């Protein structure tokens, strides 16, 4: 079975489980269009991907709280038998989306010569993805790697991206997000490939060797990130650990000209495959953190069952991340899951890194 056919089946089943209706059908078609370029590749025919830590080139993400269900995937453009840092596939997928779906390429085009270079220093140069909510149009996204000119270039490359978008006046937002210089580091730049006012430019940061208190101190700048609640969530999802000792915590911030009190300015991502014995333990932690919301846990259990393909206690690697954002009355959480086309229990930073 090709990678594209196997993941399309899982994605369609997940959409059906979520009752996405016709929106789900269109979403599967978009996934197939974006992964056509993988060709006839089976899993071993593609280079190891950064998308999931086991090297799988797809990640599924499910909103757990939303009244209307909302499904997302991320993937890596890859050429069968070519190293992942080769930029051909990433350069081809933007015009594909622009032409087939009207996706906005104007920010992408302002950046692509710098962020998708011929000879990238890092092993990966892009991810792309899509998100759909029932009854609403699909929204596409691109992620660029801020290490493509070398790890020590991440801030300079980000700043140069703001130069090209005319948004250097937003640098103070980046600067303020860094609390521990050298350990709070930007590593991805994401573009919503839409031309409307809701479209966001987001910077993702790693927080290396961070205590839960330091992660909460980063996030308290943003509306609704009460530090006590952030610390408690991290601790539950870490099984009581207080420090991100190997795999870094991740945050992202939207770069905006003003505060936004819909509480969409920032997100917390807790990595799940290095701080537990196996995915059964992770599932128990999810049941603990979402105890107050049985509808969310029923949705989570159902989606996990459609994506896992072995006993949860065999190792880690099915759960990649859980994300957390404050809401009006309750937190907004999503789970990020791997199809595990390769080996159980990936190492910190993933097999490709
Ligand atoms: N797997 C990569 C990229 C990635 C995929 N999904 C993510 C969600 C959040 C942060 C990063 C990612 C990483 O952990 O860095």
- Number of other residues whose CB lies within 10 A of the CB of residue 305: 10
74 CB under 6 A from ligand 1?
Answer: yes
Q: Which tokens sit at 127?
A: 């991810």
Please give the Cα distance from 100 to 94 (Å, whole number): 10
Q: Do 131 and 139 touch, CB atoms closer than 8 A?
A: yes
Q: How far is the CA of 51 from the centre of ligand 1 (A)?
A: 6
Please give the Cα distance from 280 to 117 (Å, whole number): 41
Nearest to 287 by CA among 274, 297, 299, 298: 297
How many angstroms separate the Cα of 117 from the Cα of each of 91, 100, 107, 113, 164?
10, 25, 16, 6, 15
- Are β-strands 70-75 and 332-337 bridged in parallel, bridged antiparallel, or unpaired? unpaired
50 CB under 6 A from ligand 1?
Answer: yes
**Which residue ranges make up the annotated binding site for dimethylallyl diphosphate?**
72, 141, 143, 200, 202, 269, 332, 334, 336
Q: Do 247 and 275 touch, CB atoms closer than 8 A?
A: yes
Please give the Cα distance from 94 to 112 (Å, whole number): 10
Q: Which tokens sit at 352?
A: 């490709």
Q: Which residues pair with 203 in a beta bridge?
A: 189, 253
Q: Which residues pair with 334 in a beta bridge?
A: 63, 323
Domain count, the chain: 1
250 CB under 6 A from ligand 1?
Answer: yes
Q: Enter the DSSP assignment of 330.
A: S
Q: Do 234 and 270 touch, CB atoms closer than 8 A?
A: yes
Nearest to 272 by CA among 229, 187, 341, 333: 333
Q: What DSSP letter does each residue of 136-176 carry, written as one string?
A: S--EEEEEEETTTT-GGGHHHHHHHHHHHHT-GGGHHHHHH
Q: Do 101 and 130 touch, CB atoms closer than 8 A?
A: no
Tell me how the structure was determined.
X-ray
Nearest CA to ligand 1 atom 4: 51
Please give the Cα distance from 308 to 312 (Å, whole number): 8
**Which residue ranges make up the annotated binding site for L-tryptophan?**
50-51, 59, 206, 321
Domain range holding 287?
1-353
- Number of other residues whose CB lies within 10 A of the CB of residue 75: 24
Nearest to 217 by CA among 271, 248, 178, 263: 178
Q: Do 208 and 248 touch, CB atoms closer than 8 A?
A: yes
- Burial state string for 61-74 with b = 16 or more CB within 10 A and e = fewer than 16: bbbbbbeebbbbbb
Element (H, E) at 85: none
Q: Enter the DSSP assignment of 352.
A: T
Please give the Cα distance from 110 to 207 (Å, whole number): 28
321 CB under 6 A from ligand 1?
Answer: yes
- 309-312: list long-range contacts, CB under 8 Å, 24+ apart: 309/339, 309/340, 310/340, 310/344, 311/280, 312/278, 312/279, 312/280, 312/282, 312/283
Q: Which residues pair with 140 in a beta bridge?
A: 130
- Work out the widest C-alpha separation in the chain, in whole angstroms: 50
How many angstroms separate the Cα of 12 from the Cα of each of 71, 97, 280, 327?
10, 20, 25, 29
59 CB under 6 A from ligand 1?
Answer: yes
307 SS3 class: helix
320 SS3 class: strand
Q: How far is the CA of 57 from the centre of ligand 1 (A)?
A: 11
Rounded (10°) CA dihedral 160, 165, 171, 177: -90
- Burial state string for 188-200 with b = 16 or more CB within 10 A and e = fewer than 16: bbbbbbbeeeeeb
Q: Which residues are catalytic?
A: 59
Nearest CA to ligand 1 atom 11: 250
Please give the Cα distance from 178 to 286 (Å, whole number): 29
Please give the Cα distance from 137 to 140 (Å, whole number): 10
């Amino acid at each position: 079975t090709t990678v594209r056919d196997a993941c399309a089946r899982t994605l369609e089943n997940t959409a059906r489980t979520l009752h996405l209706g016709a929106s789900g059908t269109e979403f599967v078609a978009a996934f197939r269009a974006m992964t056509d370029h993988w060709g006839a590749a089976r899993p071993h025919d593609l280079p190891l991907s950064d998308v999931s830590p086991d090297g799988s080139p797809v990640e599924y993400a499910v909103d757990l709280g939303g009244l209307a269900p909302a499904l997302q995937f991320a993937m890596e453009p890859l050429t069968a038998g070519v190293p992942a840092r080769d930029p051909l596939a990433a350069r081809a997928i933007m015009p594909l989306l622009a032409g087939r779906y009207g996706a906005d390429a104007t920010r992408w085009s302002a950046l692509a010569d710098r962020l998708l270079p011929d000879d990238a220093h890092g092993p990966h140069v892009s991810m792309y993805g899509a998100e759909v909510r029932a009854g609403a149009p699909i929204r596409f996204k691109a992620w660029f790697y801020l290490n493509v000119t070398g790890p020590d270039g991440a801030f300079n490359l980000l700043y140069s991206a703001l130069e090209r978008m005319g948004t250097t006046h937003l640098w103070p937002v980046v600067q303020a997000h860094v609390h521990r210089a050298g350990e709070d580091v930007p590593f991805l730049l994401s573009l919503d490939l839409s031309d409307d006012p809701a479209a966001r430019v987001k910077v993702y940061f790693r927080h290396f060797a961070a205590d839960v208190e330091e992660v909460a101190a980063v996030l308290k700048a943003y509306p609704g990130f009460e530090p006590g609640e952030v610390r408690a969530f991290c601790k539950v999802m870490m099984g009581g650990r207080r420090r991100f000792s190997d795999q870094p915590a991740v945050t992202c911030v939207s770069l905006l000209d003003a505060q936004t009190f819909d509480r969409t300015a920032a997100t917390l991502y807790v990595p799940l495959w290095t701080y537990a014995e196996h995915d059964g333990e992770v599932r128990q932690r999810v049941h603990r953190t979402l105890a107050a919301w049985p509808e969310a846990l029923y949705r989570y259990d159902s989606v996990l069952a459609g994506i896992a393909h072995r006993g949860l206690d065999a190792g880690t690697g099915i759960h990649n991340y859980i994300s957390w954002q404050p809401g009006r009355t309750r937190p907004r959480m999503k789970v990020y899951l791997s199809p595990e086309m390769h080996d159980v229990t990936p190492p910190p930073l993933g097999v490709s890194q």
